[PDB]
């Protein structure tokens, strides 16, 4: 994966902000939560969204 | 309709019921819906329609440039321009900009060959200019009529003027500039320090 397009980051931010407490800095839990929480009929886009939420959780813990 | 912009909220809530109050208190109209609410008797006319082209590698990409004059025939007029790929939305854009740019026009007598105190003509000598078309509007006696060009006659009639004398300079064949200069003079009736 080189660069995440607009809809990837948009879905990432909306799912991260609607439910800020259902995501932490692991990929497996992130994939499980996004599969539980969003209508994601594509494994690749789901995996990309989970990884991108993982990176937001990393940066949000890093900022404090 | 949703009264976007707070002036539209008051206008739909009926706290402002007449269009005169906006121009009396210097209120800026940002939406056309206030205009159609406060002036249901608004007539719009298509003053000019020119085809306009841009050169590109595959050929010219044409766009219609439609000029629209809106008026209530009672001292309220506005003119707007719309460029669009098709004539219908070009006219729609021009109508919307005319409705946004509507303004009151001061009327009266003032001709030396007349004495009636009616709004049939312009109150004093006024001027307008758009690019190089200069149009001087002069008060006239009642019954003379509109002594301007055709598009100028349309704009003046929409603004609610019966008789006037015109003096023009520059290429009036530029229909957009002629219409804009006439509308500019009608709006410059309000810049006179009474």
């Amino acid at each position: 994966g080189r660069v995440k397009p607009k809809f990837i980051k948009s879905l990432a931010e909306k799912l991260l902000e609607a439910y800020p407490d259902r995501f932490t800095e692991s990929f497996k839990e992130n994939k499980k939560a996004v599969a539980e929480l969003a209508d994601i009929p594509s494994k690749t886009v789901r995996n990309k969204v989970a990884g991108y939420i993982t990176r937001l959780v990393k940066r949000q813990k890093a900022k404090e | 309709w949703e009264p976007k912009t707070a002036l539209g909220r008051m206008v739909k809530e009926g706290k402002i019921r007449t269009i005169d109050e906006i121009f009396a208190n210097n209120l800026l109209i940002k939406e056309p819906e206030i205009v159609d609410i406060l002036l249901p008797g608004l007539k719009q006319e298509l003053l000019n329609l020119n085809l306009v082209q841009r050169q590109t590698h595959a050929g010219e990409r044409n766009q219609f440039q439609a000029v629209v004059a809106v008026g209530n025939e009672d001292g309220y007029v506005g003119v707007g321009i719309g460029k669009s790929r098709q004539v219908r939305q070009a006219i729609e854009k021009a109508t919307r900009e005319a409705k946004l740019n509507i303004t009151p026009v001061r009327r009266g007598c003032g001709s030396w060959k007349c004495s009636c105190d009616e709004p049939h003509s312009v109150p004093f000598v006024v001027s307008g200019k758009s690019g190089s078309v200069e149009v001087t509007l002069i008060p006239a006696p009642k019954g003379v009529g509109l002594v301007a060009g055709d598009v100028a006659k349309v704009v003046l009639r929409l603004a609610g003027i019966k008789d006037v004398w015109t003096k023009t300079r520059g290429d009036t064949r530029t229909t957009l500039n002629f219409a804009l200069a006439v509308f500019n003079a009608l709006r410059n009736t309000y810049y006179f320090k009474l």
């Binding site: 809809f7 209508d39 009929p41 594509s42 | 098709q86």
Partner: protein, 77 residues
């Protein structure tokens, strides 16, 4: 014949009339809408496409219509 389409809640349509509509030189007049997929899966497989030619005075005058109704939620959400 487009307010008939706005009667439906279609998120996408595309109408092309190809021929000598005004002169003896063809022009390919075309109008379109917004959220209407053009290539890939829906277009060419799950977007209602219809091509018909009508014998007018001087030609067949092709008409191509691509439509997607208000419930064609392709894989983007």
């Amino acid at each position: 014949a487009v307010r008939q389409l706005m009667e439906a809640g279609a998120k996408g349509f595309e109408i092309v009339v190809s021929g000598k509509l005004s002169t003896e030189r063809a022009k390919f007049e075309k109008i379109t809408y917004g959220k209407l997929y053009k290539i890939g899966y829906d277009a060419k497989n799950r977007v209602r496409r219809a091509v018909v030619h009508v014998l007018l005075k001087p030609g067949i005058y092709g008409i191509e219509v691509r439509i997607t109704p208000a419930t064609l939620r392709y894989s983007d959400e």
